[PDB]
Amino acid sequence: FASLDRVKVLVLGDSGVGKSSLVHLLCHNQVLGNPSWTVGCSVHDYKEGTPEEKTYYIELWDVGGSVKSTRAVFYNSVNGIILVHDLTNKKSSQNLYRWSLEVNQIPLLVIGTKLDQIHETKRHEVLIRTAFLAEDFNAEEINLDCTNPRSSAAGSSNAVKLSRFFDKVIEKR
Ligand SMILES: Nc1nc2c(ncn2[C@@H]2O[C@H](COP(=O)(O)OP(=O)(O)OP(O)(O)=S)[C@@H](O)[C@H]2O)c(=O)[nH]1
Numbered sequence: 177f178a179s180l181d182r183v184k185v186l187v188l189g190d191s192g193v194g195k196s197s198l199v200h201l202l203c204h205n206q207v208l209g210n211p212s213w214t215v216g217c218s219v220h221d222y223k224e225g226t227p228e229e230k231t232y233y234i235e236l237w238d239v240g241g242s243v244k245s246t247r248a249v250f251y252n253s254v255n256g257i258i259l260v261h262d263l264t265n266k267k268s269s270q271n272l273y274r275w276s277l278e279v280n281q282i283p284l285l286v287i288g289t290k291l292d293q294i295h296e297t298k299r300h301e302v303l304i305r306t307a308f309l310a311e312d313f314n315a316e317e318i319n320l321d322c323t324n325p326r327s328s329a330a331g332s333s334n335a336v337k338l339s340r341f342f343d344k345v346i347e348k349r
């Protein structure tokens with residue numbers, strides 16, 4: 177039971193926040209990438225566990241740039257946006273609003289990277305602030321280490337949140 181409906185998700189964020197690493201994580205390295213563009217396939221079971229279950233082959237696109245470098249020719253037919261910020265760089269979170277303007281009804285997900293580089297002391301403060309940040313985009317938030325494959329393991333809280341986001345992208349479209 178495989179769906180042929182297109183689902184295109186853009187991965188946006190400042191240079192170096194972890195976008196390519198995140199695409200590799202979320203797609204289990206089913207990724208084709210080069211200096212210009214990176215696309216991954218994230219296989220997603222929509223409404224899993226019901227007679228309505230269908231498998232979707234979601235595209236995750238990472239084309240880089242900066243909010244001067246514009247890649248708008250890659251922003252066509254987008255159904256959802258993952259906004260990526262580096263939890264050790266507060267400036268990368270301030271730029272998510274501008275990134276979102278490069279492309280309302282399009283669902284958004286906010287993902288913070290490099291959680292492993294935040295000490296248990298300063299962690300509570302960063303996470304309170306990222307909850308507020310996600311609220312600004314009417315979005316759920318996931319904070320993780322992109323280099324740890326357990327970060328989005330099947331059945332984890334993070335995976336449930338990502339799955340909820342993909343379900344919404346499919347429904348809105
Ligand atoms: N410790 C740690 N390192 C990370 C994490 N995510 C990314 N990195 C590291 O940060 C560096 C940048 O990550 P990368 O995935 O290349 O960013 P990018 O957003 O794709 O960078 P770009 O210039 O091509 S646009 C890499 O060395 C990568 O290994 C993370 O969650 N934890």
Ligand SMILES: [Mg+2]
Pocket residue numbers: 195196214238240
């Ligand atoms: Mg990249």
